[PDB]
Amino acid sequence: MSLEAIVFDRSEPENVSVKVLDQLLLPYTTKYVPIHTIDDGYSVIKSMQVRGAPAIAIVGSLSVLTEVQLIKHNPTSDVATLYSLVNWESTKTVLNKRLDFLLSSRPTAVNLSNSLVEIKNILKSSSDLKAFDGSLYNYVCELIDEDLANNMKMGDNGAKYLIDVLQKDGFKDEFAVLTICNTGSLATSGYGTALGVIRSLWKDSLAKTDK
Template structure:
């Protein structure tokens, strides 16, 4: 069973989020009962990954409302007048929802899924107002919607895993070695993952020989988070430095168990934060150079997309590596040209470029 970073229960209402800042040294789930606590989880990067951010935002809103509603039913005297008004008046509830969504949107202004989530929940609220729903009915609609978003994301991820694995297996290889970058698994989604979902599916089907994953400097999402997931799921894997990928492709993969060169790498699989209409892809810094080396070594480069700290004495501390005064260039993302991408895997299927083309016709695929 894959790792769960978001644990939600409807009755009695409960939401716990795995604090990713403490990984891989400590596994601590933190309870979220209010919108403000959800904001802090996202803003402090205790939760990360576009899908997961959107889901935590939605669940923090509905868990807040569920707890308020439960208290209203069982002990209304425990509530202040403003909360009582919110639960008695649909228009006041709508104001609370709007203010809450605006606040959550500020927690991570670059997360597109967060704003999409906000729009969906606001539309549900407006729909309830138009249908003359009372506050309880609107809250129930919001809860149903948030839960469905979580289920839909998990379904999308499993579809990506299947489509991506099937596409790779078209090479005829039955035992696959792959490389991945950053963290694109359960920690970044509702569960299973996108690029890591493809790796999970290959493993579940008995087709994965070995997965290699990069440290992903400078934030080390690979060495901290992907390593945690792969070990948790007992997926055969090896951590490598970002600068080792070309050497690994050239040597056709190092076998850690025998200390010898092993099977060739079939594919490099990464996620994406944005995909342009022509297929250019924005992702974690370092992705572009992986695509270049994949092209040189004739290895498939696959994009899966639907959307320095250390621990010392159990305290998060900053660790300085270069001397003080050194100038640093530290971008978070880079763009990989569509020309270097073999295929883009979505929950709807695999998109390939038409013969002789350097760009993808994504509009045609999405409309279809």
């Protein structure tokens, strides 16, 4: 999948893998960056190797999950030594600090903050790391699956809305649209926001020309 900004293998809920396209190098170079820790999440966001508001939130969120799974699976790893694992409150203190670090990556898009607030709420109601791990896995799956489903929904909402506006105005012809930046599968979990609407419009147009 040439267009997938974030490749999330969720097939082992306890041992997910995450890698991201380096968007600095597209379109001629397709290179993946592994995500293992919050430092990786911070790094790819700050450097704009991953960008796009929702993709930023998704990679950020995923990097917390890979981090907590790594410290479970390798208590001797570099990241694990940041933690006093003997004590849940002490563990949370460092995790919260690292969530604040991640938040500082790039300020303007709000998606990341919105997700990190939710992750903190999950952390505050988890009794131990294991519970947090499981609930965070659920959270990231939901964040991603809702992002894609909602992109399709909004795409169709926007397409229908414009067609209805034009049909009311008695416009009957071919039309063009303008867009800016990147809001497609490269900026999101897939399908996209403004580019989603354009994709929905294209589907409608193909149906019409087929006929």
